[PDB]
Amino acid sequence: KHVTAAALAEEIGDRLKQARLNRDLTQSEVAEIAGIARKTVLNAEKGKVQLDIMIAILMALDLTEQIDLFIPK
């Protein structure tokens, strides 16, 4: 991939948005589940998010089982 880190972060944000839509959830619903502000979820879907917050969002979508496979050892 010949892409900047910020552009790839935006692509990951889009994947998070798609995962959410596939689960028929709104940003407000994801925020309520994770116990965070709706604005924080909105920002995450733009690629602007802290790692622990992103993980909390993913846990709200039941999408953290793959993380065991991320740079493991």
Contacts with its own copies by CB under 8 A lie at 1, 5-6, 8-9, 12-13, 15-16, 18-19, 22, 34, 44, 47-56, 58-59, 63-73
Distances (CA, A) of 13 to 9, 40, 72, 73: 6, 12, 22, 26
41 in Cβ contact with 30 (< 8 Å): yes
What amino acid is encoded at 50 in this protein?
A: Q
